[PDB]
Amino acid sequence: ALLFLPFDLEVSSMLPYIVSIYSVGIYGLIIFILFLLILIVGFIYEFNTKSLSITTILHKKNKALVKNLY
Amino acid sequence: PTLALTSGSIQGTHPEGFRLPRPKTWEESSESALSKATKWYLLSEIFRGLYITLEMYFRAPYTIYYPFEKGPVSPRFRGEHALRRYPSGEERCIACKLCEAVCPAQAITIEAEERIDGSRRTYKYDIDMTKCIYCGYCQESCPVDAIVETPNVEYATETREELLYNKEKLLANGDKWEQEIQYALDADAPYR
Amino acid sequence: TNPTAFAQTTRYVKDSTEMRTLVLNLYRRYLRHSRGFVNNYNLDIPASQVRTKIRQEFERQRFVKDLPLKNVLYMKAQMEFQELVNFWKQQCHVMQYFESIKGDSFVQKFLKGAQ
Amino acid sequence: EEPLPVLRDLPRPEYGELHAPVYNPAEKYKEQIEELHKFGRYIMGCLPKFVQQFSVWKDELVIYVAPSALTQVATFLKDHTSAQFKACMDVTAADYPTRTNRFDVVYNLLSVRHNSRIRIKTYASEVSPVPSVVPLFQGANWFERETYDLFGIFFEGHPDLRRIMTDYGFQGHPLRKDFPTTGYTEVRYDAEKRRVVYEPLELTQAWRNFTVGSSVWEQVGDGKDFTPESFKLPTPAPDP
Amino acid sequence: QAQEILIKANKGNPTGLTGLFQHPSPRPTLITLYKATLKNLEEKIPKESVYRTAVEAFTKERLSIVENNEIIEDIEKKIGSGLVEELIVQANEEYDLIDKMAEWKAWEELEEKPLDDQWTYFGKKL
Amino acid sequence: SGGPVPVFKKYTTGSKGIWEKIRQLLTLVPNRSTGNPLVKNYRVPPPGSQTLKYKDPVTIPAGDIVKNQYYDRDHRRNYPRLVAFDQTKVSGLLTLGSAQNPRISVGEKGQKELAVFDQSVSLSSTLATIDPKVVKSELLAEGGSPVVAPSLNKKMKFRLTEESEHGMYPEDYPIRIFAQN
Ligand SMILES: CCCCCCCCCCCC(=O)OC[C@H](COP(=O)(O)OCC[N+](C)(C)C)OC(=O)CCCCCCCCCCC
Ligand SMILES: CCCCCCCCCCCC(=O)OC[C@H](COP(=O)(O)OCC[N+](C)(C)C)OC(=O)CCCCCCCCCCC
Ligand code: SF4
Numbered sequence: 006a007l008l009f010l011p012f013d014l015e016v017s018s019m020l021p022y023i024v025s026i027y028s029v030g031i032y033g034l035i036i037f038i039l040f041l042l043i044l045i046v047g048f049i050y051e052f053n054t055k056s057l058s059i060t061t062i063l064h065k066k067n068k069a070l071v072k073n074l075y
Numbered sequence: 076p077t078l079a080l081t082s083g084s085i086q087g088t089h090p091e092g093f094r095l096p097r098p099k100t101w102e103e104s105s106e107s108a109l110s111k112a113t114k115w116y117l118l119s120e121i122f123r124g125l126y127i128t129l130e131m132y133f134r135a136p137y138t139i140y141y142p143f144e145k146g147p148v149s150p151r152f153r154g155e156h157a158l159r160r161y162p163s164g165e166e167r168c169i170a171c172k173l174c175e176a177v178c179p180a181q182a183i184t185i186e187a188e189e190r191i192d193g194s195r196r197t198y199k200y201d202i203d204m205t206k207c208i209y210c211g212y213c214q215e216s217c218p219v220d221a222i223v224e225t226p227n228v229e230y231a232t233e234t235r236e237e238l239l240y241n242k243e244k245l246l247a248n249g250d251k252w253e254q255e256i257q258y259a260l261d262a263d264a265p266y267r
Numbered sequence: 268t269n270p271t272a273f274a275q276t277t278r279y280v281k282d283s284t285e286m287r288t289l290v291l292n293l294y295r296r297y298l299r300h301s302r303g304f305v306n307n308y309n310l311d312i313p314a315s316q317v318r319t320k321i322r323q324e325f326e327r328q329r330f331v332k333d334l335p336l337k338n339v340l341y342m343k344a345q346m347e348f349q350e351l352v353n354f355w356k357q358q359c360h361v362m363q364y365f366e367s368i369k370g371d372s373f374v375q376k377f378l379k380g381a382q
Numbered sequence: 383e384e385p386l387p388v389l390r391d392l393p394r395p396e397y398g399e400l401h402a403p404v405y406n407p408a409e410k411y412k413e414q415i416e417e418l419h420k421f422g423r424y425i426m427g428c429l430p431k432f433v434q435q436f437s438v439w440k441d442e443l444v445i446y447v448a449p450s451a452l453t454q455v456a457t458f459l460k461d462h463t464s465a466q467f468k469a470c471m472d473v474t475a476a477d478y479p480t481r482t483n484r485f486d487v488v489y490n491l492l493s494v495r496h497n498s499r500i501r502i503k504t505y506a507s508e509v510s511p512v513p514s515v516v517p518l519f520q521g522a523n524w525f526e527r528e529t530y531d532l533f534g535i536f537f538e539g540h541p542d543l544r545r546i547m548t549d550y551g552f553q554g555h556p557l558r559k560d561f562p563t564t565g566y567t568e569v570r571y572d573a574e575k576r577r578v579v580y581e582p583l584e585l586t587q588a589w590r591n592f593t594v595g596s597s598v599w600e601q602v603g604d605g606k607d608f609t610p611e612s613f614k615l616p617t618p619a620p621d622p
Numbered sequence: 623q624a625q626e627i628l629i630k631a632n633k634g635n636p637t638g639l640t641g642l643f644q645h646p647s648p649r650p651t652l653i654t655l656y657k658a659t660l661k662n663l664e665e666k667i668p669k670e671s672v673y674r675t676a677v678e679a680f681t682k683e684r685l686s687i688v689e690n691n692e693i694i695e696d697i698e699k700k701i702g703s704g705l706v707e708e709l710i711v712q713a714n715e716e717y718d719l720i721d722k723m724a725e726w727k728a729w730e731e732l733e734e735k736p737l738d739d740q741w742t743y744f745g746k747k748l
Numbered sequence: 749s750g751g752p753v754p755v756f757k758k759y760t761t762g763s764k765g766i767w768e769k770i771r772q773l774l775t776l777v778p779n780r781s782t783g784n785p786l787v788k789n790y791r792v793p794p795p796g797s798q799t800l801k802y803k804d805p806v807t808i809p810a811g812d813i814v815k816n817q818y819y820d821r822d823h824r825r826n827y828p829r830l831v832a833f834d835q836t837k838v839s840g841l842l843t844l845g846s847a848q849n850p851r852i853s854v855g856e857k858g859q860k861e862l863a864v865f866d867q868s869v870s871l872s873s874t875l876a877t878i879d880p881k882v883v884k885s886e887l888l889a890e891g892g893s894p895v896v897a898p899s900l901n902k903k904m905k906f907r908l909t910e911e912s913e914h915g916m917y918p919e920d921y922p923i924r925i926f927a928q929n
């Protein structure tokens with residue numbers, strides 16, 4: 006839910022580019038791509054940490070039975 | 076000489092090939108990367124799963140329009156109870172009390188004595204139709220086929236008092252369903 | 268597998284004195300949860316009577332002498348506590364436990380059929 | 383594309399008079415009887431301190447042990463390679479009030495290893511505890527919970543013993559012979575209290591005991607002898 | 623002495639049974655436990671006990687088969703009690719039993735005889 | 749074997765004519781039946797309108813009028829008697845042998861020996877004092893080998909099959925089908 010907010014403001018700020026794609030030309034297209042690359046570096050960061058994974062740290066443990074002969 | 080020497084048995088010995096081979100790694104998958112991803116991205120088995128479901132849409136359904144139609148019944152079917160008569164009109168039951176003693180649920184209450192003319196007849200005969208398990212033992216044990224189960228099933232009642240069938244009620248059922256009882260008795264007589 | 272809440276191991280005690288310490292300890296545990304018993308079970312009486320009637324049932328068994336009788340009455344002693352804490356009994360059962368209630372003369376019992 | 387046959391009309395075999403051999407069904411267990419007898423004795427010889435006696439019936443071997451001999455014999459039958467009974471299938475009891483210890487606790491063990499089943503019998507009284515096999519077999523947690531609920535047997539060492547079948551606060555253990563089949567109380571919905579209440583038992587039609595008209599003659603004889611001829615004490619032959 | 627052996631691996635290729643992974647050193651581990659059991663048997667259990675004779679019957683037999691069968695599949699078919707990873711736990715449990723068998727002193731006189739009316743059912747002695 | 753079967757060889761209602769060709773062109777597996785039973789074949793003579801006159805079947809030895817004494821086939825009264833072997837009888841069998849392999853003297857000298865094991869004899873003592881060959885011959889097996897738990901089914905064996913034989917899931921699916929062998 007928290008990461009929804011940064012990714013939503015990224016999507017909603019693509020709105021000005023939609024209705025002005027022609028008149029900004031290549032210049033506004035390159036800026037738009039750059040505007041997306043910086044946010045993608047965030048996507049890489051939260052993909053590597055696996056932040057959204059629920060994980061199971063509490064349970065699902067297995068062990069090796071090791072004899073301790075004397 | 077048996078394998079008791081090593082404390083082993085024929086039963087303990089696993090068949091040949093029981094040990095699993097080395098599980099394949101990512102480099103031993105026969106499918107190419109694109110084939111595995113085209114099936115994954117284009118939902119190969121799901122679109123098939125939809126297609127099989129859509130085949131049923133052009134098939135004849137199974138539904139029957141009860142109460143205008145009825146599902147199959149067989150001569151052995153167990154339903155509502157009825158006390159029968161001979162063709163001459165005399166009651167078939169000779170108050171022998173067999174059915175009362177078989178009845179797993181103790182749903183039958185019989186009180187009997189010598190009739191006014193000397194016959195061995197019953198003056199009280201109840202079935203607690205809310206206690207019967209509709210099991211057919213009374214029917215099997217009757218030596219004169221006095222107590223049977225008619226193929227009727229549609230007799231649901233508003234009050235539970237109406238499900239305490241006394242001797243008047245059961246004899247009125249035997250008259251009502253005599254023709255249908257004969258249908259089943261004629262068909263399944265030899266099998267008993 | 269793990270045991271449920273407020274559970275205890277079942278051990279057969281062999282000393283008389285050891286049991287009374289367990290018996291006395293268990294008594295406050297009933298007393299401690301008495302307000303929660305009222306709150307969780309929505310009892311219509313203040314917690315004072317709940318503490319009142321708990322004590323009486325302990326005394327009912329006070330004078331047992333033989334040891335093997337002592338354990339079983341303690342084994343079942345714990346079980347009733349464990350069910351009460353964990354909200355396993357329904358409100359109907361607990362109400363009826365505390366909602367329970369001089370004998371008639373010989374003529375009176377004779378008059379109404381007696382026993 | 384031939385039309386489907388009408389299976390009603392296809393010819394059926396003709397038989398004259400049928401013959402079926404008549405032979406004692408207990409004979410086919412003969413090989414199983416000796417092998418259980420040998421393996422039953424083997425356990426007794428290994429553990430004379432615990433095995434009071436052993437018995438064989440058809441294809442079922444029973445080991446009779448005291449309550450204090452339970453954990454030992456159970457452990458031996460679980461760990462010994464010759465008899466690996468890792469799986470415990472049933473824990474139950476039975477009430478025989480005539481005997482001093484009425485309850486008779488019975489265990490059934492399964493050996494998926496050698497494809498065998500063994501039975502342990504151990505007695506108990508109303509107040510005497512019995513060792514719990516939960517530390518060995520985890521599957522006995524609920525089978526012991528059920529036996530206490532229906533027999534009141536004290537199980538020593540059980541991590542969580544409580545009612546499993548009967549209602550909470552149910553008084554009396556149902557499967558004891560002295561407990562009547564209809565119980566002591568019954569429930570109904572009381573309008574005044576707005577809740578379902580317990581009342582003493584009162585049957586509109588009292589149960590009818592037809593069991594009195596049982597057989598007055600003994601119905602089955604003394605039985606037959608099927609002990610292997612290798613487990614009977616030889617008769618000392620007469621002298622010249 | 624401090625010889626530490628692995629009984630149940632917690633990682634590796636499966637053996638067809640869930641939770642029973644392949645054992646990295648099957649043959650040496652079996653030989654170590656068979657030699658220990660034969661050694662540790664005589665330390666605690668006297669000779670007149672049949673159980674001691676029973677274990678030395680096949681623990682010797684399973685010790686001789688392991689040495690002469692380097693192929694694992696020849697070990698299994700000749701012992702005839704499952705996979706080699708299972709035989710490790712059989713050997714281990716065979717070892718734990720003697721520690722308890724010695725403690726119970728289960729070669730001695732029957733500790734608790736049944737009462738005269740115990741194994742009688744409906745008026746007949748069993 | 750359980751190989752696929754053409755649709756017209758199954759007792760279900762199937763299309764005919766132009767619709768059969770449409771059905772084969774559009775279905776995934778053309779030999780799959782609709783599942784609606786054939787009206788002209790399924791239960792056509794109802795159970796209450798059959799033609800077979802049933803006759804009570806009777807095998808000869810147990811249904812005959814002759815050579816059919818009931819005590820010959822009265823198996824319910826030939827049940828195996830319940831015998832429990834206590835420690836004492838095990839000792840007596842161990843010391844004296846069995847009825848098949850006697851190890852008891854004859855006449856009154858033997859009758860002395862049997863009476864020894866007619867009262868309590870704890871088995872712990874018996875194994876302490878007896879020939880070690882006795883245990884290897886009577887108690888244990890095959891020269892001292894233990895007694896493995898007997899098998900309820902000496903013919904219970906299994907073997908691994910493969911999809912070309914068992915027809916089920918191929919090798920990739922995580923289950924294996926076991927035959928009898
Ligand atoms: C064309 C527009 C409509 C369909 C859109 C979706 C296409 C899905 C298939 C592509 C994915 C894939 O992976 O395709 C390839 C897959 C799997 O092939 P395989 O298992 O390797 O084949 C085995 C080896 N052979 C190649 C020798 C046979 O084929 C399918 O499962 C085909 C599914 C067809 C039925 C579903 C379509 C009808 C749905 C509803 C239409 C109104
Ligand atoms: C480049 C071309 C772009 C095409 C874009 C289309 C992509 C669609 C999704 C494909 C990915 C996928 O199906 O993924 C499967 C995901 C997650 O699977 P996972 O957790 O990663 O495990 C599997 C992958 N493994 C083993 C490699 C890790 O969950 C699902 O089962 C989602 C199924 C949704 C079905 C909803 C019904 C369809 C309705 C529409 C048709 C009537
Ligand atoms: S059908 Fe069975 S349960 Fe019902 S009245 Fe007859 S014997 Fe009793």
Ligand code: SF4
Pocket residue numbers: 167168169170171172173174175185213216217218219220221222
């Ligand atoms: S078994 Fe038949 S004849 Fe006998 S009491 Fe019942 S209904 Fe009457």
